[PDB]
Design a protein around this nucleic acid. Structure first.
Lengths: 62, 58
DNA sequence: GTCGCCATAAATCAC
DNA sequence: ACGTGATTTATGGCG
């Protein structure tokens, strides 16, 4: 009755690569994400979002 | 990892079932229950997130 | 406009 | 193993 009432997991190599990069820089330029994307068979949007989530994850340590 | 205190799970359930037309506890009503229950506002968020979806799934 | 935040949904993961 | 608390991909829209 109530209104409010009504994903792929990345590989071990993909996460490691994203973690590494995040470790160097928390923010990624559009060119950097276009690069990483081709580098890991993920989209530019997926990289963007992965970094948005990783930041919200780091922030959850305040 | 523990499964919560009963009193804490006493509180969380109480709340959710009360306001069921909009089971979305204001950002501050989160510290209220997090204080009451002793858990973290974060754990409250997880709880309602989990409760909410598993609720429609049963 | 232009871009990140942030609360959630859902699916998974994991004590 | 399994229940349940936690974490991971994705979205929307607000600021």
């Amino acid at each position: 009755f109530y209104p409010w009432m009504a994903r792929q997991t990345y590989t071990r190599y993909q996460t490691l690569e994203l973690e590494k990069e995040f470790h160097t820089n928390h923010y990624l330029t559009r060119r950097r994400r276009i690069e990483m994307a081709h580098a890991l068979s993920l989209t530019e949007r997926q990289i963007k979002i992965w970094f948005q989530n990783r930041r919200m994850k780091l922030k959850k340590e305040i | 990892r523990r499964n919560f205190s009963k009193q804490a799970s006493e509180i969380l359930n109480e709340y959710f079932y009360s306001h069921l037309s909009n089971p979305y506890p204001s950002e501050e009503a989160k510290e209220e229950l997090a204080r009451k229950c002793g858990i973290t506002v974060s754990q409250v968020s997880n709880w309602f997130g989990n409760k909410r979806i598993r609720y429609k799934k049963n």
